[PDB]
Structures are given as structure tokens and as C-alpha cells.
Amino acid sequence: PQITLWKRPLVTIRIGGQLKEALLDTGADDTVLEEMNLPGKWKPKMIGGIGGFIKVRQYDQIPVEICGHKAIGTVLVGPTPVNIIGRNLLTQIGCTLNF
């Protein structure tokens, strides 16, 4: 698709057979999702954003379907204000910025 940006680029993703709304965010390096329980061993990780550092659990090789497109990659879970799909998965679905 072509998504214009007069509205937030909020998309339905499915992960763990859960449907969630997430923002397509070219300014985020990583995908970070609101607290949820995923099967698997996780690494604790601290990540920094503008208001400060948050503590997240790192899950690798998680399958995620984003607007009908499959991706397999790291998901960081923790206290983000919104579900954010960052560049590690936007690259996998072939996403580019155009102007």
C-alpha cells in the first residue's frame, strides 16, 4: 500500500495469535510493544528514547504479520506509550519513505 501521513500510520499487526494496533515508525530502530507475555527466553535490555531510559524484555525470532506481510525478528516488550514497529521489521516488509 501507500500510506499518506495526514493521519497517524496505525496498522493492525498479529503476533501470538493476538491482533494489536501499532504505529509504523521510521524514527525507531527497534520494535517495542506494550507489556504482553510471549513464550521464550528473553534478555533484559535498557533502551533510551526522549523522556529517558525504559527497561524492556528482548525476544528474538518472533513471527509478526504487519498488514498482511510476514516478518520474523526481535520484539522488545515493555512500558512504551504505544506499540511501535521500528526499522528492524519495516525493512523486512519492504517499507520505504518516498517524496
Add this chain to the structure above:
Amino acid sequence: PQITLWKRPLVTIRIGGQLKEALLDTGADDTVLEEMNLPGKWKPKMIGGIGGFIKVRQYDQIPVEICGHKAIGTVLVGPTPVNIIGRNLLTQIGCTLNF
């Protein structure tokens, strides 16, 4: 141009006669720039990101040139390590997400 997301989408912008680099950020509603002195009146705002809130100063009708494209709009100035171009200016230069 078409920008892939293998790396951070940093582009060159010009404000005043200052040459700066900035992150193209589809998840940001607002443009937030590093601490600088701009013309006109401003009002404080609190904006929250990952990690919490920062206080910024709001300037309206600032001309910003981003990859040779002219935009004019509100800019929030605050303590950020990166200049972030949000959706309010991204629509002005006709930028879209595509996959």
C-alpha cells in the same frame, strides 16, 4: 527521492541559514528540534516520548527546508540530541510510506 530504512533516515535540513541533520519520523506528530534561538513568540509545551515527558518551546510559522523542499509550520525546540521531523512537515513535502 526514495529512502530505504537499512539505516536511520537522516536528511539535511536548513532553518535560518543553519544547516542541520534530521530524522524523518513517521511516528512523530510534531517536529522537535535541538535547542536553538528562533524568531517570534513561543509558548511552552510538554511532549511525551519513550521514557517520559520533556518540556519544549513552541514556535509557529517557521520555514524549514528539507532536502530542497520548502515547508512552513510549527516547530517545538527542546533538549533533544536529534532533530526529528514529524508528520506536520512530512505531509508538506509530499512524503509517503510505501510497501
